[PDB]
Design a protein around this ligand. Structure first.
Ligand SMILES: CCCCCCCCCC[N+](C)(C)[O-]
Ligand SMILES: [Cu+2]
Ligand SMILES: [Mg+2]
Ligand code: NA
Ligand code: NA
Ligand SMILES: [Zn+2]
Length: 334
């Protein structure tokens, strides 16, 4: 209430081609996973084997920077019109965010939370806290394995046939209970640090445990793709990006939330990948070989998130959309 609230893009609509198929976009908002331990970026361990095996169909972005080093900064920033370097916390809090605008355009927006909170971003859209289900197959000590989200996916997919944006907010690589982020099938690197007292384990075991968390991210993204890839009637996109990275003892630094100005690359350099369904490849208007090249050669950040999502919903009458910030715009047919 401190300053008047600005509704943005009040006349927004979708401008999808006439007679088009449903468009279903999944935004996986990761947590703590860093670029330097991401197999597709050339890490010496293959922490992303399922995505690597999918080959050309996964677009990987080797140079992406976060807008903050904690969830409290990164989430509101990445869902706002503001860029990191001009972010105004107060202004952002008193205006519509990305999800408010997309919902106003008539898109079904749903937020499934498994990471302790949306930091105010999903207040005005349908949202559920999946962690609270406290299912023994996934959950212990108030935290749940991210595959619990998959159990709620089909309900969203089948809610109706409107275009949709589904946000899956994952707990990812969050520590210091890194060992609780994955299961036996992803416990590849050993020995591990099976305590929250990470300062008491060797740096070698800490890296091993963190790397196992990335294997779980990889299989999670793969399972989301598997829910969509056989729906030939559906134009689907899966987009994954982390909120920030992590420090694993380098120079005495652990966890995250270092002030951005002094934050090491481990905390600011984050993974990002995209996958497109067959129908999206056919009717989505994107030159895929163009996009693979752009992804390899350019530097991106959370600043690109807002316009990339608007572009994926064919949003029109939008004064917030910036073509130069839309990752796909330079490879989209006019
Ligand atoms: C307060 C930080 C906001 C970011 C603005 C960075 C300058 C953009 C203008 C660049 N330009 C070459 C056109 O002058
Ligand atoms: Cu206020
Ligand atoms: Mg932004
Ligand atoms: Na945690
Ligand atoms: Na194992
Ligand atoms: Zn975080």
């Amino acid at each position: 209430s401190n300053i008047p609230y600005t509704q943005l893009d009040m006349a927004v609509v979708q401008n999808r081609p006439a007679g088009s198929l449903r468009r279903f976009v999944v935004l996986v908002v990761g947590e703590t996973t860093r670029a330097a331990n991401w197999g597709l970026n050339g890490y010496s361990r293959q922490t992303t084997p399922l995505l690597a095996a999918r080959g050309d169909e996964i677009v990987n972005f080797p140079q992406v920077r976060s807008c903050g080093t904690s969830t409290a900064h990164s989430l509101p920033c990445m869902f706002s019109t503001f860029d990191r370097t001009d972010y105004d916390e107060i202004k952002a809090e008193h205006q519509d965010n990305l999800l408010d605008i997309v919902q106003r355009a008539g898109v079904e927006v749903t937020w499934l939370e498994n990471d302790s909170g949306c930091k105010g971003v999903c207040g005005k859209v349908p949202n559920t806290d999946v962690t609270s289900l406290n299912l023994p197959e996934y959950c212990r000590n108030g935290e749940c394995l991210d595959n619990i989200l998959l159990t709620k996916f089909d309900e969203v997919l089948n809610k109706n046939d409107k275009d949709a944006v589904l946000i899956l907010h994952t707990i990812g690589s969050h520590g210091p209970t890194y060992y609780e982020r994955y299961t036996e099938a992803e416990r590849k690197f050993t020995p591990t640090c099976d305590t929250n007292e990470i300062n008491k384990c060797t740096r070698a075991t800490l890296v091993n445990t963190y790397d196992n968390t990335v294997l779980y991210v990889d299989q999670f993204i793969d399972k989301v793709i598997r829910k969509l890839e056989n729906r030939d009637d559906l134009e689907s996109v899966v987009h994954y990006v982390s909120d920030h990275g992590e420090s694993l003892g380098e120079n005495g630094m652990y966890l995250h939330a270092a002030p951005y100005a002094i934050a090491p690359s481990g905390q600011t350099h984050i993974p990002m990948v995209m996958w497109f369904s067959k129908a999206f490849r056919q009717h989505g208007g994107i030159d895929f070989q163009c996009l693979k090249q752009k992804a390899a050669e350019n530097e991106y950040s959370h600043d690109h998130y807002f316009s990339t999502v608007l572009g994926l919903m064919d949003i029109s009458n939008s004064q917030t959309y910036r073509k130069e910030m839309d990752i796909l715009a330079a490879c989209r047919r006019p």
